[PDB]
Design a protein that fits this description.
2 copies of one chain form a homodimer.
Chain A lengths: L2 H13 L3 H6 L1 E9 L5 E2 L1 H9 L3 E13 L5 E14 L4 E13 L2 E8 L2 H8 L6
Parallel strand pairs in A: 1-6
Antiparallel strand pairs in A: 1-2, 3-4, 4-5, 5-6
Chain lengths: ~130, ~120
């Protein structure tokens, strides 16, 4: 599997709510860097972090994807809109770009760039006019 | 000029503080979308917006760059750290990913993805 294919598979597995299968593609000591959040280290911690969002449907849409490097190793760049339906019925739609470093079908680092305030506001529950 | 070359040239001009030359590569009606900020429309408005930062030195470092499409048209994706020195000696280093749509050597859309909180924290006086 090429770097591009590895990330395409990762995103497909996330979109099938297969979080265990997706995280299987992360390296054991993966750096998972949501740029405005604390950094996460390792597959298990990445899996646990992702489960903090109680999602019942996930639709991470890829608008553009391209890779550096070769068949074995490279960095895959993505432009996305990450949609979630939560167990309580809340819908999220977060615009994000992400870079994925892949070596031999394993994601060694994953860096997602988005705005935290937008995320936090979408997570919030006259009170106002 | 290919999409990749257009964006490389744009970034080189930004890094030389040549904001007029950089903006010349933006379409007259460019969509300039700093994702967590108001959208800017057109070359003149993009030039004015970039001038809002009183920068005396600029170092936008491209860590990774890759393009979709063909020799004429496509989207260039970038992973960067955008560094600035301002007139009062304050510096900034904003981690950002950007997507640039190019057609025939003109950037028709530029979408930059970063955290507004981090930007505002660095602009703190």
């Amino acid at each position: 599997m090429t770097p591009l294919e590895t990330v395409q598979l990762f995103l497909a597995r996330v979109n099938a709510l297969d979080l265990d299968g997706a995280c299987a593609l992360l390296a054991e000591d993966v750096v998972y860097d949501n740029v405005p959040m604390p950094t996460v280290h390792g597959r298990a911690a990445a899996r646990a972090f992702l489960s903090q969002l109680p999602a019942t449907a996930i639709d991470w849409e890829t608008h553009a994807i391209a890779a550096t490097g070769d068949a074995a190793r490279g960095t895959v760049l993505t432009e996305r809109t990450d949609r979630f339906t939560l167990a309580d019925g809340r819908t999220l739609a977060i615009r994000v770009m992400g870079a994925f470093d892949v070596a031999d079908g394993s994601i060694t680092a994953w860096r997602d760039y988005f705005d935290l305030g937008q995320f936090m506001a979408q997570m919030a529950p006259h009170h106002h006019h």
